[PDB]
Design a protein around this ligand. Sequence first.
Ligand code: ATP
Ligand code: ATP
Lengths: 425, 425
Amino acid sequence: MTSAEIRAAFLEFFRQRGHAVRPSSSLVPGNDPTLLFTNAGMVQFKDVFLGREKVDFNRAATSQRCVRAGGKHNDLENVGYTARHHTFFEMLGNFSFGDYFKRDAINFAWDFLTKEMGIPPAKLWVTVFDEDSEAEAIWLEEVKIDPTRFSRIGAKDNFWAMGDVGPCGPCTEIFYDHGEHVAGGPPGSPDEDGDRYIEIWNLVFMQYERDKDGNLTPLPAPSVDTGMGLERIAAVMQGVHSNYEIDIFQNLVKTAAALAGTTDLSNSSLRVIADHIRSCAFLVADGVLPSNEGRGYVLRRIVRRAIRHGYRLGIQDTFFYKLVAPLAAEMGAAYPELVKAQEQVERVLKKEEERFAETLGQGMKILENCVAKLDGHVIPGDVVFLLYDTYGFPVDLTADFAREHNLSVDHAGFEVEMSAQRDRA
Amino acid sequence: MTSAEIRAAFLEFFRQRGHAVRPSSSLVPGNDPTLLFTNAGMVQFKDVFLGREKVDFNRAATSQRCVRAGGKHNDLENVGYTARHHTFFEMLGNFSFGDYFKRDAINFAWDFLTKEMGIPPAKLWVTVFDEDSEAEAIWLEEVKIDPTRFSRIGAKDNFWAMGDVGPCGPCTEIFYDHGEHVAGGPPGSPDEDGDRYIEIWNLVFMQYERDKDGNLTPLPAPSVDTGMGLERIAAVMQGVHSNYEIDIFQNLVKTAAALAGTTDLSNSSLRVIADHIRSCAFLVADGVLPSNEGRGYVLRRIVRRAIRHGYRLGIQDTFFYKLVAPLAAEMGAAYPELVKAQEQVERVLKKEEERFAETLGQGMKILENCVAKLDGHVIPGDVVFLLYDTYGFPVDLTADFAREHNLSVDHAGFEVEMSAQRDRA
Ligand SMILES: Nc1ncnc2c1ncn2[C@@H]1O[C@H](COP(=O)(O)OP(=O)(O)OP(=O)(O)O)[C@@H](O)[C@H]1O
Ligand SMILES: Nc1ncnc2c1ncn2[C@@H]1O[C@H](COP(=O)(O)OP(=O)(O)OP(=O)(O)O)[C@@H](O)[C@H]1O
């Protein structure tokens, strides 16, 4: 089953159950100058959940484009290192605005995974907040799932809050078990962080409200916000362990491999490049341009990290913008604004890669020389600062190179150099 | 080697190296109204490290009484469940106020452990911050420790900051390996939290200054603060795996066993009672009295949790204050104020146990009845609030009973009940 078929089936399943299918919001948040990029389906509905905005539907469903490259939800460093993390991904979500609550949300998700998608329950694993007896009863006594594939988890993973004040409540999560050929343990075990038991669907129950003085009260109309990664469930439905092996990435990875002259289609730097073109092209299409401040600098950082991975692969000629075309062919039916903006996106990414290529090769020679002469395992702060200040290397780009060689960078020493520079500038 | 001999050998070792041996400060912090209790040897010297207070010595050593039962980390819930956690413990520390730095600090610690204490290097394990090449070079190239018993760890465990602003810097830690008979893995492994590799000594290097804007600059006079748990090194030096098996706790546990009429010195509630008399008696000796606010409520909570464990053991008469006498006999030479205050401490703890005994028996009947009839795994919030509001059960005491029966408590439901109560007023 293709990713496009899963996306369409998800939305139709919830439309049949009375959910208004709404378009994805932009990656640039409209009403939040404190959020870098839209990072969940919830973002555009935040004022509805708060009761600050009224809409003519009380349940909705979206496939929301998200980027997690900043804040605590920063998966940029996991890209290329796990089977399950992207910068750009689509979050399939259903929302209840004071309408249904835990019973329907749990039944909707279980019906979709086990009935519409036909996933064997023996491959699924469920977690609840360990103080949420309602969710546990619904799962164990109503749905009647296997209680040996069930974990009760504390507030760090399974209790959610919109902020210090505002709505909060427990969460329940559904995981897919990729089997004994993948390292890792089930949720709650010391090895839960492995790629074997992958979190597929997170259901948030807005149950309580905390006021400015800290009082907790019950929400007058409890609400639901859920989120499932399209790529992870597509991997499940296409029989592969890594998100990068699904249909949606095949043309991207093949094109990058051709541009690098390689047959190693599983190469981690090709996967990084395929991930980064998605976030970079969609970010530009949503109006972000490279810069040295704010949202433009996150875009600049990801673009330049993609260029460096091409350098690592031996690519000698401008290449990154050539992946906009297979991306738009693959995803343009779902995201026509990408097709409409394709030429402008290519021009922005070409220009940025050319700007960085002015200094990349010379900066890489310095780095390679540093590693060759290095006594310890830490690239020194003055070298990091030199690459940043003279060669346009973001610190995290240098650190990404370093980690490929089992090295770290001296972040504190770099910050000391920055402070010394501010005094001189 | 007895705990008192280790304490004295530690202080003398550093006195021989020019350290002013200074007395422990009180458990009640004087110059930090946001800290509940003194939780490290650093606390009384914070203003010296900050340069706000001048002293006639630039290097020092203390055996500091600490309580960690609130705030960050908070080890109250670990007491009785691990070989290594207390509420009250003594932290052996050496301090450099802009004097020596990483090299001396590392050699001082390795000399004390491997030469003064004679601990085999093969039983020790060292961690450094993974960006601290100075610490790594000193250990590996100067001291020349076994590089296979060495871990590079990230900023969460091996980078320290005094606050959002102020001094910060890398840490290096020394662990003792209790061997194959104890579960757990080395620092940095998924199973690092086990009791096999126990952290003995933490060395903090104040190397940088972070300002209100987030900028780092080098500290004008780098400084050192170290801390080593007396009980953990005493277990090592006495050939036992658990803190509760050292000389000080052999006496306390045996006395508790006599009060409970049992020969089963391995009963976990005896270890809890033995730990809690230390925190409760020293807190009272330092002038804290039970109350329903602030520091007095933490004392009240620990006292009442100790009483609840006596109830679990079947103790039928007022008992907790009777452990003050063996505590004073065991620790009174090092802490004469405990001897001076012994009768006052006894009276305070007796009165609190008597005040609580008015309702403990009835509340326990409710709790036992609730457990017998309970559907699910969560004690409901209204029962939690009843036990709190009418029977004087702190929420964490009820939760401590609950986990003994594989149960949790509904904290959010309790807070809802508290808000409902405020509304009725
Ligand atoms: N970086 C990512 N790459 C790919 N898929 C992701 C990524 N982040 C989240 N997802 C998918 O989106 C779903 C919803 O994300 P969300 O962050 O709300 O849940 P969560 O990961 O449990 O939250 P938290 O980690 O903060 O507890 C996840 O269950 C996962 O399937
Ligand atoms: N609750 C406790 N019970 C017994 N010993 C303790 C306790 N907390 C700390 N110690 C001992 O005191 C030493 C110094 O503790 P300190 O808090 O400075 O370091 P830490 O515990 O590594 O800090 P972190 O909170 O970052 O883990 C520890 O290495 C340990 O030997």
